[PDB]
Amino acid sequence: GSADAEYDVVVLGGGPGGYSAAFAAADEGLKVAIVERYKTLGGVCLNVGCIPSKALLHNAAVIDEVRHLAANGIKYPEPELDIDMLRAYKDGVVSRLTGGLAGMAKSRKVDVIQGDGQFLDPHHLEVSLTAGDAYEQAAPTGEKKIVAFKNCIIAAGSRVTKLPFIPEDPRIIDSSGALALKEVPGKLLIIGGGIIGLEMGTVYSTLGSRLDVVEMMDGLMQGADRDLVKVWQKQNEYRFDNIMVNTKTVAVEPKEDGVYVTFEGANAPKEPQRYDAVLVAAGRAPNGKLISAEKAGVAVTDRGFIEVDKQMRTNVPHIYAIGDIVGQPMLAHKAVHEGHVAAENCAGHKAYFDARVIPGVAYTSPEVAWVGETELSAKASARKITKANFPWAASGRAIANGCDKPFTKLIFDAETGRIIGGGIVGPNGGDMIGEVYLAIEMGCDAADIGKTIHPHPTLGESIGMAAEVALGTCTDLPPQKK
Amino acid sequence: GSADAEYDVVVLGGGPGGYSAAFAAADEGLKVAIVERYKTLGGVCLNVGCIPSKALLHNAAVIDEVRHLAANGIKYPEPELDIDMLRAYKDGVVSRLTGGLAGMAKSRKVDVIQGDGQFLDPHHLEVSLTAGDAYEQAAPTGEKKIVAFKNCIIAAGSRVTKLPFIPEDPRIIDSSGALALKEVPGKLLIIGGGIIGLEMGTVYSTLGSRLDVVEMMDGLMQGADRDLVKVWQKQNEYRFDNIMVNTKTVAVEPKEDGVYVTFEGANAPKEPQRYDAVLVAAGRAPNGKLISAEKAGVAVTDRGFIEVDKQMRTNVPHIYAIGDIVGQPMLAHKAVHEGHVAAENCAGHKAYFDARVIPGVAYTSPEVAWVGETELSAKASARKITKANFPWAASGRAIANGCDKPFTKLIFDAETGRIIGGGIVGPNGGDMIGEVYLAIEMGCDAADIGKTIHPHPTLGESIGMAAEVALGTCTDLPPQKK
Numbered sequence: 001g002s003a004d005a006e007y008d009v010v011v012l013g014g015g016p017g018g019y020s021a022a023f024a025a026a027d028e029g030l031k032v033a034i035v036e037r038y039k040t041l042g043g044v045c046l047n048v049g050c051i052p053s054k055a056l057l058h059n060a061a062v063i064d065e066v067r068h069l070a071a072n073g074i075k076y077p078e079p080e081l082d083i084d085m086l087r088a089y090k091d092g093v094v095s096r097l098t099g100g101l102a103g104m105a106k107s108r109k110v111d112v113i114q115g116d117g118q119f120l121d122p123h124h125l126e127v128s129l130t131a132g133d134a135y136e137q138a139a140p141t142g143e144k145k146i147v148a149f150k151n152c153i154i155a156a157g158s159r160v161t162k163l164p165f166i167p168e169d170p171r172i173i174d175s176s177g178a179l180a181l182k183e184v185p186g187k188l189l190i191i192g193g194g195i196i197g198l199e200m201g202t203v204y205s206t207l208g209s210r211l212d213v214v215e216m217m218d219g220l221m222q223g224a225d226r227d228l229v230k231v232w233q234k235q236n237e238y239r240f241d242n243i244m245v246n247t248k249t250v251a252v253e254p255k256e257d258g259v260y261v262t263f264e265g266a267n268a269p270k271e272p273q274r275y276d277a278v279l280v281a282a283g284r285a286p287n288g289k290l291i292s293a294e295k296a297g298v299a300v301t302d303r304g305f306i307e308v309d310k311q312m313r314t315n316v317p318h319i320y321a322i323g324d325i326v327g328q329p330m331l332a333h334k335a336v337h338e339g340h341v342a343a344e345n346c347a348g349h350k351a352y353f354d355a356r357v358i359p360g361v362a363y364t365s366p367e368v369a370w371v372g373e374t375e376l377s378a379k380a381s382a383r384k385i386t387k388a389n390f391p392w393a394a395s396g397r398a399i400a401n402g403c404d405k406p407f408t409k410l411i412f413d414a415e416t417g418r419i420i421g422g423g424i425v426g427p428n429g430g431d432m433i434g435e436v437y438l439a440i441e442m443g444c445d446a447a448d449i450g451k452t453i454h455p456h457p458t459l460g461e462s463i464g465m466a467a468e469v470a471l472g473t474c475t476d477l478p479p480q481k482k
Numbered sequence: 483g484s485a486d487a488e489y490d491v492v493v494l495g496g497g498p499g500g501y502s503a504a505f506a507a508a509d510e511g512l513k514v515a516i517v518e519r520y521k522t523l524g525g526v527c528l529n530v531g532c533i534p535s536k537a538l539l540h541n542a543a544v545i546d547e548v549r550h551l552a553a554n555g556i557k558y559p560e561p562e563l564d565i566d567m568l569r570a571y572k573d574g575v576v577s578r579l580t581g582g583l584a585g586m587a588k589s590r591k592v593d594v595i596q597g598d599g600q601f602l603d604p605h606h607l608e609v610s611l612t613a614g615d616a617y618e619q620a621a622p623t624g625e626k627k628i629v630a631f632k633n634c635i636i637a638a639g640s641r642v643t644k645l646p647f648i649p650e651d652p653r654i655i656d657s658s659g660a661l662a663l664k665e666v667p668g669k670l671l672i673i674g675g676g677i678i679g680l681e682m683g684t685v686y687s688t689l690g691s692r693l694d695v696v697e698m699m700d701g702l703m704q705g706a707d708r709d710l711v712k713v714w715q716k717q718n719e720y721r722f723d724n725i726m727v728n729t730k731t732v733a734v735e736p737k738e739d740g741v742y743v744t745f746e747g748a749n750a751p752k753e754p755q756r757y758d759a760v761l762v763a764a765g766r767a768p769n770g771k772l773i774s775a776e777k778a779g780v781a782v783t784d785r786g787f788i789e790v791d792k793q794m795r796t797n798v799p800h801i802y803a804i805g806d807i808v809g810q811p812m813l814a815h816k817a818v819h820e821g822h823v824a825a826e827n828c829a830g831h832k833a834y835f836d837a838r839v840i841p842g843v844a845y846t847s848p849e850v851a852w853v854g855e856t857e858l859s860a861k862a863s864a865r866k867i868t869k870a871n872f873p874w875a876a877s878g879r880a881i882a883n884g885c886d887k888p889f890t891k892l893i894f895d896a897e898t899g900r901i902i903g904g905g906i907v908g909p910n911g912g913d914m915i916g917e918v919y920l921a922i923e924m925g926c927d928a929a930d931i932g933k934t935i936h937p938h939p940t941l942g943e944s945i946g947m948a949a950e951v952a953l954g955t956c957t958d959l960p961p962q963k964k
C-alpha cells in the first residue's frame with residue numbers, strides 16, 4: 001500500500017516506438033502502461049523533431065517557390081514574416097497531434113504514467129513521478145510509484161550528442177532550440193553536415209540566415225549516394241558562405257558580439273569566425289545506459305544501445321527494446337515497425353522484424369530519398385550491382401515544375417537482376433521511394449517495375465522509366481547499348 | 483520515280499503512342515518512319531494537352547498556397563500576373579520538349595514525314611505533304627508521297643468532340659483555345675464535368691475567372707469513386723457559382739455582351755446565363771474513320787475506334803493500332819505502353835499488352851488518383867471487395883501541409899485478399915498511385931503492403947497505413963474491430 005501497479009506490458013517511453021508498441025499490445029487485449037517522463041506522447045519525433053521540422057520546411061519551400069514564379073510573370077514582393085505566428089503554427093500542428101495521441105491512449109485504456117522509469121529488478125520499474133506540461137521540461141515530484149510487468153518494452157530513444165568543448169550560451173543551440181524559432185540569426189554555424197542540421201539550415205537560410213556548415217567527414221548527408229548529394233549540394237550551394245567539409249571545429253568561444261569559432265582542416269578560414277548563433281547537429285546518443293537496465297539483467301552496449309533479436313527481445317526474455325535505443329538508422333518509421341513486432345511477441349504471437357528494407361529521407365530542397373542497397377554499401381560488401389538512373393532532365397513534369405536537375409536511380413542485383421536499392425533526389429522524393437520500397441520487399445525485377453504502367457506526366461513515373469532504362473527499353477531517352 | 487518510300491514500319495501519328503512505337507521499333511534495328519501532319523512530335527499530349535495543362539496547373543497551385551501561408555504569418559499581396567510571360571513559360575516547357583523529341587528521331591534515324599497519311603492499300607500510305615510550324619495549324623502543300631511498309635502502327639489518336647448546336651465564336655473554346663491563355667474571362671462556362679475541363683477550370687478560377695460547370699451526368703469526374711470526388715468537390719466548391727449537374731446545355735447564343743447560354747435540368751437557372759467565355763470540354767472522338775483505313779482492309783467501329791488484340795494487331799495482321807484510336811481510357815501512359823508492345827510484335831518478338839492496370843489522374847487541387855478496381859466497377863461486376871481507407875486527418879504530414887481532408891483508399895479482393903484497386907485524393911496523388919500500381923501488378927496482399935516500412939512523416943505512408951487498417955493493425959487510428 002502506497003504506489004505499486006501490475007501490468008502485462010509496460011512500455012518505457014511514449015515515442016513513435018513506444019506508443020505504437022503500447023497501442024498494439026493494448027490492441028491484443030493486453031493490460032499495458034506507457035511510462036513517459038513528459039506529459040505529451042509522440043516522443044522526440046512528434047514534439048521536437050519529425051513534425052515541427054517538416055511543418056517549418058514546408059513553409060520555407062513555398063516561400064522559395066514564389067521566388068521562382070516571378071520568371072513565369074507571377075510577381076510577389078518579399079513576404080512579411082511573423083515568427084510569433086510562424087512559431088505558433090508549428091506548435092499548432094504538434095499539439096493537435098499530441099492532443100490526439102492522448103485521446104487515443106484514453107480510448108485504448110492504456111495508462112500513461114508521467115514519470116522517469118528506472119528498472120528495480122527484472123519485473124519492476126521504479127517510476128520517479130514527474131511534473132511539467134512542456135515536452136523536455138518535466139520535473140520530478142519527489143513522489144515514486146512501483147510498477148510491475150509480465151513484459152516490458154524498453155523504447156527510451158536517444159538524445160542530442162553534446163560536444164565536450166562547446167561552452168554553454170543561449171546562442172549555441174541543438175535542434176530543439178533551433179525548432180524554437182527564437183529569431184533568425186543573421187549568421188548561423190551548423191556543426192555536422194547530416195540531414196537534421198542541413199534540414200534546419202534550409203529553413204533558416206530561406207528565412208534569412210547565411211549559413212556555414214562544418215563536417216568532419218568527406219561530405220554532406222553522409223550515408224546517402226554522393227551522386228544524389230551532388231544534385232542537392234549543387235542547388236543549395238548558394239545558401240552557404242562556407243561548406244567546410246573534412247574540417248575540425250576546434251575553438252568555440254562566445255563573445256559579446258556573437259559566438260566566435262575556430263575550425264581546423266582545409267578551405268577552413270584560418271581566422272576564427274563569428275556567428276550570431278551555432279547549431280550543434282553533431283549526432284544523437286541512445287539512452288540504454290540511463291534506465292538502470294542492469295537492474296533488470298538487460299545488457300547494454302558501451303555505446304548505449306540495447307542489441308536485440310529479430311523478435312525485439314533483449315538478453316532478458318520478457319524484456320524487449322525498440323527504436324533508436326536498439327540501433328541505427330534512428331528513424332521514427334523504423335521504430336513504429338519494431339514497435340509492432342515486440343507488442344505481438346508480448347501477446348504470444350511469434351513476430352520477427354522481417355522487413356528487409358528501411359527508408360532514409362533528407363526532407364531538404366530537393367529531398368534526397370534512398371533505400372536498400374546503395375552504391376557505397378554495395379561497394380563496401382563488394383556486392384555486384386546494376387544501377388539504372390533516369391534523369392529528370394528528360395521528365396516533362398520536372399521540366400514543367402522546374403526540377404529537371406534531379407533523377408531517379410534503381411539499383412539491381414547483377415546476379416539475380418532483383419531490385420535491392422533505390423535513391424530519388426527531387427521534390428516528394430520521400431513520397432515516392434515507398435514504391436522502390438514495396439518493389440524491394442516483393443523481390444521485383446526491372447521487367448516487373450518497367451511493365452508497370454506509371455501515370456504521366458509525373459515525377460512518380462521515373463521509377464518505371466528507370467526500370468526500362470534497366471531493360472534498355474526507354475524511348476524517352478537516347479537508345480541504350482545501340 | 484516521284485515520291486515513293488519503303489519501310490519496315492511506318493507509324494501514322496507522332497503522339498505519345500506513335501513516337502514510342504516508332505523509337506522502339508527503331509530501337510529493334512527496324513527501318514521506321516513517323517507520318518505526322520504537324521511539324522512537332524509528342525502529339526496532343528506534349529503540344530496541346532498533358533504538359534502545357536500541367537505547367538499551368540503548377541503555377542496556379544503555388545499562387546493558391548501563398549493565399550494559405552498568410553495564416554502562418556507569411557504575408558504576400560496578390561501577385562502581379564503577366565500572361566504574356568505566363569503564356570510564353572508554358573510555350574517554353576513545351577518547345578524544349580518538342581525540340582528534344584525531334585532531336586531524338588534524328589539520332590534514332592527515324593524519318594519524320596510531315597503530311598496527312600491516308601491508306602492506299604494494305605501496304606501503302608498515300609501521304610499528302612503538309613506545311614506549317616505550329617501544332618494544329620499545318621496546311622497541305624498539294625505535293626504527295628507514296629510510302630510502303632512491311633508493317634504499319636496506326637497511332638492517329640482522337641480529337642475534341644464538337645457539340646452540334648454550339649455556334650462558332652472566338653469566345654467558345656475547346657481545351658487548345660483555353661490553353662491559349664488569350665485572357666482570363668471574368669465568367670467562364672465549362673460544358674462537361676470531366677477531368678480536362680475541371681483541370682482547365684481550376685487554372686482559370688485561380689487566375690481570376692468565376693466558373694459555372696454543366697454536367698449531364700449525376701456528378702463530376704465521372705469514373706472516379708464519388709468518395710474521392712466528394713473530397714475534391716468540398717475543397718473547390720467555392721470556385722464555382724453553379725455546379726450544374728444532371729443538366730442539359732440547350733441554348734448557346736453568342737451576344738455583343740458575351741455568350742448567353744440556356745440550360746435544361748434542375749438547380750439550373752431558368753434564366754439564360756451570360757458568360758464572357760464557354761469552355762466546351764464535352765469529351766474526345768477517336769480518328770479511325772479519318773485515315774481511309776478501309777483501303778488497308780483495317781476494320782473501324784462506327785464510334786471510330788480500331789478494336790485490336792492484346793498484341794495491338796488489328797484485323798489486318800501486319801497492321802497494328804495504339805493509343806486513343808484503339809479505346810478508353812484515352813491517356814498518354816496507356817499509349818506509350820501499347821506503343822512498345824506493337825513495336826515489339828513488328829520486330830517479330832511476341833508481345834502482349836499484359837499490364838492488368840492503367841492509372842487515371844485528375845491533376846486538379848487536390849489531385850484525385852485511382853487504379854484498378856473501383857467501388858463502382860466492383861459494384862457493377864458485383865465483384866466482392868474489401869476497401870481499407872486511411873484518413874489524412876490522421877496524417878501528421880497532411881495536417882502539417884494542410885491537406886488533412888484527403889485520404890488513401892486500398893481495395894481488396896474479398897476472396898483472395900489481393901489488392902485490385904487504389905484511390906488517393908490529395909496533393910501528389912498521381913505521384914503516389916504508382917505504388918498501389920506495382921502492388922496490383924505484383925498481386926500483393928494487405929500484409930505485403932502493410933509490412934512495407936514506408937517513411938514518415940509523409941503522404942506516401944498512408945498506402946502502408948491503409949494496408950494495416952486492412953490488417954486491423956493501425957495504431958495511428960482508433961482500434962479496428964475491438
Ligand SMILES: Cc1cc2nc3c(=O)[nH]c(=O)nc-3n(C[C@@H](O)[C@@H](O)[C@@H](O)COP(=O)(O)OP(=O)(O)OC[C@H]3O[C@@H](n4cnc5c(N)ncnc54)[C@H](O)[C@@H]3O)c2cc1C
Nearest residue numbers: 013015017037043044045049050116117157323324331332
Ligand atoms: C529534429 C528531429 C527531426 C526528426 N525528423 C524525423 C523524420 O522526419 N522522420 C523520421 O523517421 N525520424 C526523424 N527523426 C528521428 C526521431 O524522431 C525518431 O527516430 C524517434 O522519435 C524514434 O522513436 P523512439 O521511439 O525510439 O524514441 P523517442 O523520440 O526518442 O521517445 C523516447 C521518449 O521516452 C521518454 N523517456 C526517455 N527516457 C525515459 C525514462 N527513463 N523514463 C520515462 N520516459 C523516458 C522521453 O521523454 C521521450 O518522450 C527526427 C529527430 C529529430 C531530433
Ligand SMILES: Cc1cc2nc3c(=O)[nH]c(=O)nc-3n(C[C@@H](O)[C@@H](O)[C@@H](O)COP(=O)(O)OP(=O)(O)OC[C@H]3O[C@@H](n4cnc5c(N)ncnc54)[C@H](O)[C@@H]3O)c2cc1C
Nearest residue numbers: 495497499519525526527531532598599639805806813814
Ligand atoms: C488538354 C489535354 C490534356 C491532357 N493531359 C493528359 C495527362 O496529363 N496525362 C495523360 O495521360 N493524358 C492526358 N491527355 C490525354 C492525351 O494527351 C493522350 O491520351 C494522347 O496524347 C495519347 O497519344 P495518342 O498517341 O494516341 O495520339 P495523339 O495525341 O492524339 O497524336 C496523334 C498525332 O498524329 C497526328 N495525326 C492524326 N491523324 C493523322 C493523319 N491522318 N496523318 C498524319 N498525322 C496524323 C496528329 O497531328 C497528332 O499529332 C490530355 C489531353 C488533352 C486534350
